[PDB]
Write a protein that binds this DNA or RNA. Sequence first.
RNA 1: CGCGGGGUUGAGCAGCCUGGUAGCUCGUCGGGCUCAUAACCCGAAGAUCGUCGGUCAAAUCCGGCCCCCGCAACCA
RNA 2: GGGAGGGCGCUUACCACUUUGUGAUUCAUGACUGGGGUGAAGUCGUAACAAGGUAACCGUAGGGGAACCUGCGGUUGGAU
RNA 3: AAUUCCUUGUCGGGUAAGUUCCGACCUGCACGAAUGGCGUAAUGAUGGCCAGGCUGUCUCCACCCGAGACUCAGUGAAAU
RNA 4: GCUCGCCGGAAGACCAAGGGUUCCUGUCCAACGUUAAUCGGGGCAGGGUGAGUCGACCCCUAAGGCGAGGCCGAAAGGCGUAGUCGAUGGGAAACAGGUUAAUAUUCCUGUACUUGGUGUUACUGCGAAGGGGGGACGGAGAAGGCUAUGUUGGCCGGGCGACGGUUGUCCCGGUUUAAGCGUGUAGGCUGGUUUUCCAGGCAAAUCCGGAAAAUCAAGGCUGAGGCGUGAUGACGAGGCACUACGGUGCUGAAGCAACAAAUGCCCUGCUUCCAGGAAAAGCCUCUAAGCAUCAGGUAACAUCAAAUCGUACCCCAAACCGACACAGGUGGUCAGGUAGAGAAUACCAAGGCGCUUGAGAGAACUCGGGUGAAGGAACUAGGCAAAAUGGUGCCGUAACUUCGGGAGAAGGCACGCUGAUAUGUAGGUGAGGUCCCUCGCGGAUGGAGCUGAAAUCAGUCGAAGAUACCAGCUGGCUGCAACUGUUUAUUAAAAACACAGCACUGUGCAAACACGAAAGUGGACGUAUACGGUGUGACGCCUGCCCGGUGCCGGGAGGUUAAU
RNA 5: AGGACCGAACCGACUAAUGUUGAAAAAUUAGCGGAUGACUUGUGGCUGGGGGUGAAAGGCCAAUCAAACCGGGAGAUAGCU
RNA 6: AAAAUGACA
Lengths: 271, 46
Amino acid sequence: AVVKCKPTSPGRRHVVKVVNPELHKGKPFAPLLEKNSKSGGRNNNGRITTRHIGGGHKQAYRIVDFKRNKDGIPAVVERLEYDPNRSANIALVLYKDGERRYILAPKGLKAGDQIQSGVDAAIKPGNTLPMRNIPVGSTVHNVEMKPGKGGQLARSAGTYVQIVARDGAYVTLRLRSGEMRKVEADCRATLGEVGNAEHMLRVLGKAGAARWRGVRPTVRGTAMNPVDHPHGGGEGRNFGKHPVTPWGVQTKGKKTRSNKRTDKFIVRRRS
Amino acid sequence: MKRTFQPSVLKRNRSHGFRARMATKNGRQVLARRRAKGRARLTVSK
RNA sequence: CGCGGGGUUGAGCAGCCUGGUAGCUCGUCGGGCUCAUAACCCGAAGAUCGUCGGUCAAAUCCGGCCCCCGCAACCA
RNA sequence: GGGAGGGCGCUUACCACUUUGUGAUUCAUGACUGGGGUGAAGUCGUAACAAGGUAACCGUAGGGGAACCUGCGGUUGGAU
RNA sequence: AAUUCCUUGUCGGGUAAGUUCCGACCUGCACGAAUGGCGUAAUGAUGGCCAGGCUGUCUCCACCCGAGACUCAGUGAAAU
RNA sequence: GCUCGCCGGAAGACCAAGGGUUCCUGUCCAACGUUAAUCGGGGCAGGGUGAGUCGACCCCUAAGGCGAGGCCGAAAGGCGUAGUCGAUGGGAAACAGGUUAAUAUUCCUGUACUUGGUGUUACUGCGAAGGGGGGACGGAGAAGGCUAUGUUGGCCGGGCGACGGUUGUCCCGGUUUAAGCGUGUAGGCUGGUUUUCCAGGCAAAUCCGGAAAAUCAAGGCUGAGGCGUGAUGACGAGGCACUACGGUGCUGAAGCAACAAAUGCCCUGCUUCCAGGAAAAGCCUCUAAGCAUCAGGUAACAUCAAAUCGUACCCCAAACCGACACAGGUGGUCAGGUAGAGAAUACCAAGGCGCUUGAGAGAACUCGGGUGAAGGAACUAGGCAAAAUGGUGCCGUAACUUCGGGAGAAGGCACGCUGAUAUGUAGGUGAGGUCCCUCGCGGAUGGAGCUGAAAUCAGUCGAAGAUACCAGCUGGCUGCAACUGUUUAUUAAAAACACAGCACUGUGCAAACACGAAAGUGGACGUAUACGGUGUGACGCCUGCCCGGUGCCGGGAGGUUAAU
RNA sequence: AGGACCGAACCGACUAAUGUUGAAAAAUUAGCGGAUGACUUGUGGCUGGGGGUGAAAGGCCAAUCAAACCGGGAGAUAGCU
RNA sequence: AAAAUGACA
Ligand SMILES: [Mg+2]
Ligand SMILES: [Mg+2]
Ligand SMILES: [Mg+2]
Ligand SMILES: [Mg+2]
Ligand SMILES: [Mg+2]
Ligand SMILES: [Mg+2]
Ligand SMILES: [Mg+2]
Ligand SMILES: [Mg+2]
Ligand SMILES: [Mg+2]
Ligand SMILES: [Mg+2]
Ligand SMILES: [Mg+2]
Ligand SMILES: [Mg+2]
Ligand SMILES: [Mg+2]
Ligand SMILES: [Mg+2]
Ligand SMILES: [Mg+2]
Ligand SMILES: [Mg+2]
Ligand SMILES: [Mg+2]
Ligand SMILES: [Mg+2]
Ligand SMILES: [Mg+2]
Ligand SMILES: [Mg+2]
Ligand SMILES: [Mg+2]
Ligand SMILES: [Mg+2]
Ligand SMILES: [Mg+2]
Ligand SMILES: [Mg+2]
Ligand SMILES: [Mg+2]
Ligand SMILES: [Mg+2]
Ligand SMILES: [Mg+2]
Ligand SMILES: [Mg+2]
Ligand SMILES: [Mg+2]
Ligand SMILES: [Mg+2]
Ligand SMILES: [Mg+2]
Ligand SMILES: [Mg+2]
Ligand SMILES: [Mg+2]
Ligand SMILES: [Mg+2]
Ligand SMILES: [Mg+2]
Ligand SMILES: [Mg+2]
Ligand SMILES: [Mg+2]
Ligand SMILES: [Mg+2]
Ligand SMILES: [Mg+2]
Ligand SMILES: [Mg+2]
C-alpha cells in the first residue's frame, strides 16, 4: 500500500511510504542469520574503489536458499519477512520433514501457500523445475545460468523473465533489460514473478532518508577543481568539454562491453 | 586549543616500539643506523 | 582620431582577386488578356562604378578627401 | 448631657464626549494595460452565404500576421 | 535585471528634497528555456528599501563608581 | 584565633588516560617562586603503597594485524587457508565499624561468599574438534510500583536570653545501622504432562525439529521493593582527666511515624515504528569412537590452594597537552535547602578558596560600568553600538497558502498581602476498627491523621505586586537559494557544496567501473524495480528551431593503408 | 510522528569592543545558530606524497601543502646581488 | 491544375 505522508514538517512533504501489513513484525529466524560487516567501498589496499558508500544502519545477512535443490518434499510458507539485504521480501518455508529455510517471495504467495521443487512439480507460482519441463512462453524468475549455480536472473523486486523459444538443448530468454539470452535448458527457474511490485512507488523524501542507507553525497564535476576532475575549472560555470568520467573515459554514449567469450549466447543486444 | 601531541602509551609502542621496528626490513635498518651512531636508548622504550 | 569591410543603372546583391569582358532579382515604361484592378504574357529604357589626383589602357593598382559599418583603447 | 434621622464631603457601580490597534464594506483617484463600441473612398488578405470553389458547424487540443488550418469524436441546420 | 555602456533612461509612489527602493514602458550595447525559463507558501547569524517603539549614535557634552596611567619600596624586559 | 568576602551541576568529592615521588615528617634559604619569605609542588636525610573477592594477569571474540603449506611477483616482496594474536565488548566471589603523620572493600574486629585438588561415604553409565539451546543485542513513547533522598510531627539531651518580650502553638542538636541468609510480593513471560512415528540438524542421538493421539486447566521461568535475621552488636549528642595543651584515655539517653519524591531500580519489561538493529567462550543438554573392573558422573562431609604485577600523590589542574606555577584544551561517576518548569538563575549547607608584589594620591588619556535637562536617527557607508520588548492565564488575531502554516501575528486585560467561602476547599495518601478469606507481603468496607492546588467576594499597603537575577523588539515591499544541513582549523558561512526529485548513458554476472606489473579485493555474499558516470536541483505551468562544425553511435560496397 | 518549536549540558563560530613585544603563535567579554539528529563524544583500527581524503575551499595530511617531514645525489645551477 | 477583389449615392 502506497501512503503519502501529510506535510507536518518541511521535509516530510514529499514522503511516499510503501507499507505491507502482511510482513511479520517480530524477529528473524535465529539459526539462519550471519554477521554482515560493512566496508565503505574499501578493498585490501584500504583505498576506496567504488565511491559514495559508507554509514547507514547495521544489518544482519540472512542465508537465502537460491539453489532450491530439494526434490519432492512439499513445503508450507510460514510467514513473510522483511529482508534488509535485498529489495524483495523473503518467506520462511517449512518443509514437510521439519527443515526450515528462506526463499524469495513471488507476488502470488500468501502466508500458508504450498510449494514443491523438483522435475515433477506442478506448474504453479513458487514451484521450481528446469526449463526443459517448464512450458514455452511462460513467465519465470530466479533463473539460473549454469546448472547448480543458484540463480542470477530476475532476482530483484518485481522482475520477470519470458521464455521465448526452446532451441534444441538451449532456451532463449527475454530479460527485463530487453536482451535475449541463450541458456542451457537444464537450468532451474522458480516459476512465477518476484513480489513487492510497488517498490518504485516510494520516494525517500529527505537527505537523511538516503543517508541512513549507506549512500554518501556525490559531487558534480563542474564544481571540482581542474586537478580533481577533468570537467573542473571555470570562472562561474564554464564547461566547454565533452562529458567524461573522472578517469578520462567518455561517458554519454561510449559502449564499454568487451567479452568475446559469452557473445555466443547473445541473440539480440539490449536496445 | 587541542594541541598536536596527545599522549598514549599503547599507541606509542604499537607504532614506534621495538617490535614494531623489528617486524619490517625497513624498520630493521632503522635500528642498525642507531646502533652504528651509538645512541643510548634505541627506539623509544622507557 | 589607432586598425579594419564597404560606396555599382530607383532597391538589394554579384563583378575589384591579380587590368581590358558592367550582370541576377525586384522595380519603371509602352503594348496584350479582364467590365475593371491585381495576377499572367510580349517587348524596352535605365549606371560609368562617391570625389579629387597619379600605365596601350583603371569599377579593379595606388594616395588624399566624404560617408557608413566593426574591433581595440589594457597592467597599476 | 445627647439620641434617631437628614445634609455637605469622600468612595464604589452603571454611562456619554475622547484616545488607541486591527480588520470589513462602499465612493472618488491612479503611471500603464485587457477587451468592447462608434467613426472618413485607410493597409493585409477573403474566413462565411452556391458544392463559396477543401461542405458547414459543435466540444476539445496544438499552431499561425488576421480572418483561420489540422488532429480526434459528434450533427445535417450539406449540392450532385 | 546578480545581466543596461549612454544611465541619475522616461513616467508614477513614497520624502520638504530619493544616483538607492517599489510599479510600469521596451530603445534586450550583451535575457531565454535541464552549463534550465517563469512563478512560488514556509525557512535564512543571507542582499536592498520603508514605518512604529526606543534611546548619548547625534545637536553637545556634564557628573559619578571601579581597573591602569601619576608618587613611594622590591624585582626588572624588548624592538632599534 | 575572631571577623569579612568568593564558588557551591563547582573554584566540592571519586576515577580512567597521562605524569613518575611531586605523598608525610625533620632540616636549610645560595639557585627556582615575576617582591621579602621563617613558607613551597625548591635542596638535603629518613619514612610511606600490605588483596582468594578491586583492577591487571587469565578464558572468548570485533574491526584488524601476523600468517606453516599455497598463489603471484626482476630481488626486496604482495595476497591469503589452517591457526595464532588483538578491548573500547562477554566470563566466580566481601560488606559495615575501627585504626596511621603518610595505606587501606588490602591492617584489626564481626559476619559472610566463589571456583578448583585430594580424601571418606551414598548412589551412578561416563564419554567430542561434533549437534541443539542460551549467552544474544535498534530507535522513540507511555504510564504503574518502589528506592536513594528531603520536609514535618513524636522521642531524647540541652537553653531561658548582652536591648523591648521569650515556661511556651518557644530556640539548638540527634534520631544511624551494611554485605550475607530466609519468605517471596507489585508486576512480566509462556499452557502443561504422557505415548507413538518419521525424507531435517553431514555420523549417531533419549536432545532440538516435524506429524499425530490422550489427558488436566494448571504448571513453570523471571522479578524491583518490603518484612525477619546480622544487631542483647557497632555507632551515637554529649558528660568525665591529662592535657605530649596536637588529641588521647573513660562512659553513653532517644534511636519512631506521616507525607513528597527522581534523569536511579522492576525494564535485556510493555506499546509502537522502519532505517530491521555483533561474534565466540563460560553455562545447560545430546550422542560418536573408547571403556562397562575401571575411568568418569551427582550429592554430602574434611582439609589444602587461590600464585605474580598496580595500589602513595595530582586528575577539568601549579603535578596531563600548550617552551612558564600560562585567563586555553581534557572522557566517566555523586547531585543537599529555599524561590523556581529546570542540571537556567539568586542566596546558602557539606567542603574548599581570597587567585605570590604591595602602600599611597584621586590630573589629562584609555578600558569596564551607572544616571541625564529639550529634541529623538538630525550621526553614519549602514540604527554598527547602545536603548527597548521579555513570564503565566484569558479575550482576540489579516493579506497569502503546498490547507500543515502565517501565529507567540498584531493588540490588550488580571498578577502582592490578609480574611471568608472552607477554624485549608477540589484532589492525593491512607491509620484504627469491620466482613469475608484459595490463609497471605491477602480482598472489600472503612474515613483518624498527613498533604494540598486553582477560583470568587471583601479589605489593605506602595509611585510601582511577571517588582531583584532570569526572561521575543514588531510590522510593510522586494532578489537570490525550495527547506533541516556542509565549507576556506588561523581575515570570505554566502547567492557557494550537498540534498529528496528529473533526464541521458553503460553495464546479462567471471557484470560495467576502480585499487593492483600479477595473484587478488571493492562493486556484492548484490543480479536491470540492481549498479556505475554525467548534467539539473523541492513543488506548479513548461522545456521551441538547427546534425552545417567538433564528438558519439550504426554501415559495409569503393579508394588509401602496417607487420609478415 | 517530526532531518517539528522555545531553551541548559554538548557542538559551532554571525556582530562589536578589548588584545596585536597578548593571559593566549586566533583568545576573553556581551550578545548569537543547532540542541532526537545528515547529531555528538571515549577507545582501538585502515588509507602514504604525484599519493591518501575531500557535502568540493585547492581544503586537511603533527602550529608547514598548487605536491609533507628526514637523509642521500649535493659544494645541484645562478650571464644575478 | 490555377480562378483574388469592386465605397457610398
Ligand atoms: Mg570551486
Ligand atoms: Mg586534467
Ligand atoms: Mg561566464
Ligand atoms: Mg471562400
Ligand atoms: Mg470552405
Ligand atoms: Mg537554478
Ligand atoms: Mg639588548
Ligand atoms: Mg555567594
Ligand atoms: Mg624531588
Ligand atoms: Mg626570591
Ligand atoms: Mg620537596
Ligand atoms: Mg597476510
Ligand atoms: Mg610463507
Ligand atoms: Mg585470544
Ligand atoms: Mg574491557
Ligand atoms: Mg590519602
Ligand atoms: Mg589512593
Ligand atoms: Mg605557547
Ligand atoms: Mg600564579
Ligand atoms: Mg591553567
Ligand atoms: Mg549555576
Ligand atoms: Mg578615576
Ligand atoms: Mg545608561
Ligand atoms: Mg540618583
Ligand atoms: Mg537625554
Ligand atoms: Mg526625558
Ligand atoms: Mg550628514
Ligand atoms: Mg542622514
Ligand atoms: Mg542592552
Ligand atoms: Mg540555503
Ligand atoms: Mg542553515
Ligand atoms: Mg567567518
Ligand atoms: Mg546548480
Ligand atoms: Mg532545449
Ligand atoms: Mg529540531
Ligand atoms: Mg534551540
Ligand atoms: Mg597544517
Ligand atoms: Mg614537484
Ligand atoms: Mg651531481
Ligand atoms: Mg650552493
